[PDB]
Nucleic acid binder design. Structure first.
Ligand SMILES: [Zn+2]
Lengths: 211, 128, 24, 101, 82, 97, 125
RNA sequence: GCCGCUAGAGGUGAAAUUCUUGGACCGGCGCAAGACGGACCAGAGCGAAAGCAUUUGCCAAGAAUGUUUUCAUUAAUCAAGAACGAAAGUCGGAGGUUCGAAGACGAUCAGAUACCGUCGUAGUUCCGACCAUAAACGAUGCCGACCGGCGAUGCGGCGGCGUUAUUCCCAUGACCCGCCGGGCAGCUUCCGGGAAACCAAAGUCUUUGGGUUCCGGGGGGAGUAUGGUUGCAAAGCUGAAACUU
């Protein structure tokens, strides 16, 4: 039985979510050079936001990487964000152009992000026509506003407020209000956040990052 | 299947166009009617003709049949509307103002029995 | 005969003919 | 014999549309001669959704749908009965067929 | 149609047509004078002008070149000449 | 729309966490205007206190009148102890400012 | 409510029912459609995935894994992107045989028009 | 490459060749390589045709519209001549992930040296130098004129109730109802044509002439033979008879 030498560790979420205990992980025990707490330092979980809070919003999934283990508690830190596949394919219909941009914005804590966006053009309620397309200058300057907001509203913040912005998507509502003089948009999401480089791990920042 | 063929429902109708003053709603009278008014070979055709003129007289006296002639209208001119006040005698006729410009440029509209109503805002009449 | 392969077979024939004619 | 006026395409007024590959036989058709079809169903079937629902830990979780965009070549539609052969005088009907009663 | 008079066209159907397709062609531009509200030069502009027409008191711009009619600067006053 | 009417609080308390207050209010209007939430639950009073709270500091007077008309349509049942309480709490927070 | 993650690779030739922990690394059990039938014609059956689902349910019940998330997956890439016939019998049988079911998501990998496919230009005839 | 589970993976109508206790397939975090730009993507756009799709630049170029700007017949078509011309192909160099002629095996069949599987050279990919053919298709030369309608669609312009920005009656854009020009196409019509299919041109043609360029003369022989020239080569262009029916 190779399942006799496996202890069950607990995994703790960061402080931005309501619910902290997200589930139970496994490691073979220390019998040699293979230490347990290095044996899990690379676990990445795809955890939905209707699991980290008890809201209904299920389409926005989070990546949380275990950086240090204290007691039997795995302490996680934020690794990225995705939309699910059925939400992002539910929104590509015909008769609307889709405006997608990406920026690499460096936060004030040393962390580098890459933020992907999406946006579609909304058809009007008194409209007759079948097709709702934008011209190319409208797509170019809506994309310019999109990259400008997504570097300005992430640029001078710490990481905890960035993940606090990413939970309700204030950035998507801000883009949709600011871009309405060019073409009225339809649901605008930050689709994917990547974490490209992380700075040196020291325990005080994570131990204050849990509360 | 008991569907009546061409002869028992064309011959029954040409029996019904003339001789309507003899026919009725009971089958046994019309069965006895059918030998004075025709020359039919043997009785199973005659009972089938009598059954269709009984079914057609069951149908015909509450409205018009397509196949029957206006001998029906000879029955409706023999047996058989306006209101008291006409539906074109209304006392206020709403007029949207392009019609009022037309009537003013037809040398009417000095006389007023009409009342012009407010023009529509919005031009969304098409379908998407 | 499909006319591309008639073309290809006269192509092979002419390639062999010009092979046999420039030996001398 | 000209059979179709548009030649069974959407290429009017350009020289070349880039090809796509068929999902059923991998036969390289152009983008607009291929018969596009967009198949949306639920992820779990109509039968098994009655006893998926007793196992969900989440109260009132509406299950997601499966978004498959299918291209098909012209041979494998008449093999696969997606699109069937019609009369000479109802070929001018390009209204899509009714899915409602 | 088919009794239609080509020698007496109505002005609804003479402002309808393209400027080359009338009986006598006649241009769809007109000459304005722009009054600037803080100076006293009446300044003569084209309707469809292609340069920035500079006034000589307070050196402001009266009109902006666009693909159609020149959009006059907002708050001046104009009327058509003749 | 929402899937459950308690979720209006969980959304609106997240928008105030960063500090945006205009999406916080207009979510809380858009849960009340929905057609599946006019049948009385216990959570409809404390989101209506919060929506009347949020109308105060943005000083939107037109928007608070509509929702207090809409909630008055909703509690046509006998708990006007709620409708007394949501009204004077709006009339407490206006005097304090 | 100890959660695990079930991975359903539903091929046209095979059926992989793979139960792992929440990150995915520590595998708890893996049963394929090749373990429960003797024939290559019926590896992708509903029946083979039914039996494979019952065995992986009996394996994960004894370890603490009470509830499951679903990652439902087709062959993907340049091949067909419908999950085949052995997805539904495994996913019905896990909810019938004593487990609990979490969120179901389609994880079939989709390209930005990646490289050329295995058939010719002129098809698979 | 590092994990951490396990006896099959692959593939097919069915299978076998192939991979696997030196650890495959599946799962996880990673690195790199080269190709490619899905869904949005339409009878929509641009281009002389071949063709052209991630972002932001930079470099020149162009149709359309608007014009009370200028020149003053400068124009249309094209012997000779030249520019570009998919894919395959050839040569020199760099690159090589996948596909994949030839080829080696498997299995289907009487037999398949074909379709169907496993692997693969040349090639596909890029930078230079060649070759100039395609159902290069609207199987429809180009410029101009005239001749019914209709409702949309792409661009530019003009005029009209309204509705929406929000954050200043708010700016300018997004919609709504029309008009003009140019463009890709559409449905209808006893205009008219046609052998008919059908076409608003393939109409205005025995009531036969607006201008101009290449080309066809029953079917094969044959786009062959020879001659010429172009090309490293494969070949390209010009290119007939005798005879037969
Ligand atoms: Zn196919």
């Amino acid at each position: 039985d190779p399942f006799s030498k496996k202890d069950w560790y607990d995994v703790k979420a960061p402080a931005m979510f309501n619910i902290r205990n997200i589930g139970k992980t496994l490691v073979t025990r220390t019998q040699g050079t293979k230490i347990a707490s290095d044996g899990l330092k690379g676990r990445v979980f795809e955890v939905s936001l209707a699991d980290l809070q008890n809201d209904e919003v299920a389409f926005r999934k989070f990546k949380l990487i275990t950086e240090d283990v204290q007691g039997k508690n795995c302490l996680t830190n934020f690794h990225g964000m995705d939309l699910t596949r059925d939400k992002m394919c539910s929104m590509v219909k015909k008769w609307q152009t889709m405006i997608e941009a990406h920026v690499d914005v460096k936060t004030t804590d040393g962390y580098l992000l890459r933020l992907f966006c999406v946006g579609f053009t909304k058809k009007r309620n008194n409209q007759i026509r079948k097709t709702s397309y934008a011209q190319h200058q409208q797509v170019r300057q809506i994309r310019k506003k999109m990259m400008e907001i997504m570097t300005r509203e992430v640029q001078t913040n710490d990481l905890k407020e960035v993940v606090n912005k990413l939970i309700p998507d204030s950035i998507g509502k801000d883009i949709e209000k600011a871009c309405q003089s060019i073409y009225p948009l339809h649901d605008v999401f930050v689709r994917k956040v990547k974490m490209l480089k992380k700075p040196k791990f020291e325990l005080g920042k994570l131990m204050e990052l849990h509360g | 299947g008991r569907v009546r063929t061409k002869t028992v429902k064309k011959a029954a109708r040409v029996i019904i166009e003339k001789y309507y003053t003899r026919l009725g709603n009971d089958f046994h009278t019309n069965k006895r009617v059918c030998e004075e008014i025709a020359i039919i070979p043997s009785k199973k055709l005659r009972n089938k003709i009598a059954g269709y003129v009984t079914h057609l007289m069951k149908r015909i006296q509450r409205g018009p049949v397509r196949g029957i002639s206006i001998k029906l209208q000879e029955e409706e001119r023999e047996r058989r509307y306006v209101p008291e006040v006409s539906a074109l005698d209304q006392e206020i006729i709403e007029v949207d103002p392009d019609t009022k410009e037309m009537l003013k440029l037809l040398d009417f509209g000095s006389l007023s029995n009409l009342q012009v109503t407010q023009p529509t805002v919005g031009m969304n009449f098409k379908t998407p | 005969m499909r006319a591309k392969w008639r073309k290809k077979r006269m192509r092979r024939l002419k390639r062999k003919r010009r092979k046999m004619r420039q030996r001398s | 014999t000209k059979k179709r006026r548009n030649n069974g395409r959407a290429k009017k007024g350009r020289g070349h549309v880039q090809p796509i590959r068929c999902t059923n036989c991998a036969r390289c058709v152009p983008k607009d001669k291929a018969i596009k079809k967009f198949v949306i169903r639920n992820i779990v079937e109509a039968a098994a959704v009655r006893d998926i629902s007793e196992a969900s830990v989440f109260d009132a979780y509406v299950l997601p749908k499966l978004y498959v965009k299918l291209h098909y070549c012209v041979s494998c539609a008449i093999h696969s009965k997606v699109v069937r052969n019609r009369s000479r005088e109802a070929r001018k009907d390009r209204t899509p067929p009714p899915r409602f009663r | 149609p088919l009794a239609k008079d080509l020698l007496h066209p109505s002005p609804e159907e003479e402002k309808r047509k393209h400027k080359k397709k009338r009986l006598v062609q006649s241009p769809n531009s007109y000459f304005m004078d722009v009054k600037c509200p803080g100076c006293y030069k009446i300044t003569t502009v084209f309707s469809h002008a292609q340069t920035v027409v500079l006034c000589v008191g307070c050196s402001t711009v009266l009109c902006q070149p666009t693909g159609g009619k020149a959009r006059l600067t907002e708050g001046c006053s104009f009327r058509r000449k003749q | 729309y929402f899937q459950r009417p308690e979720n209006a609080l969980k959304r609106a308390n997240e928008f105030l966490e960063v500090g945006k207050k205009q999406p916080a209010l207009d979510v809380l209007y858009d849960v009340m205007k929905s057609k599946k939430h006019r049948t009385w639950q216990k959570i409809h009073e404390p989101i209506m206190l919060k929506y009347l709270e949020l109308c105060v500091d943005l000083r939107k007077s037109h928007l608070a009148k509509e929702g207090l008309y809409q909630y008055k349509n909703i509690c046509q049942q006998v708990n006007i102890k709620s409708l007394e309480d949501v009204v004077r709490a709006y009339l407490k927070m206006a005097e304090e400012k | 409510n100890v959660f695990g993650v079930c991975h359903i690779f539903a091929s046209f030739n095979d059926t992989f029912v793979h139960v792992t922990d929440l990150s995915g690394k520590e595998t708890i059990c893996r049963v394929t459609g090749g373990m429960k039938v003797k024939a290559d014609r019926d590896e992708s059956s509903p029946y083979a995935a039914m039996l494979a689902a019952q065995d992986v349910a009996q394996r994960c019940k004894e370890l603490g894994i009470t509830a499951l998330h679903i990652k439902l997956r087709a062959t993907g890439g340049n091949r067909t992107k419908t999950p085949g016939p052995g997805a539904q019998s495994a996913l019905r049988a896990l909810a019938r045989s004593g487990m609990k079911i979490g969120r179901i998501e389609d994880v079939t990998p989709i390209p930005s028009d990646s490289t050329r496919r295995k058939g010719g230009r002129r098809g698979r005839r």
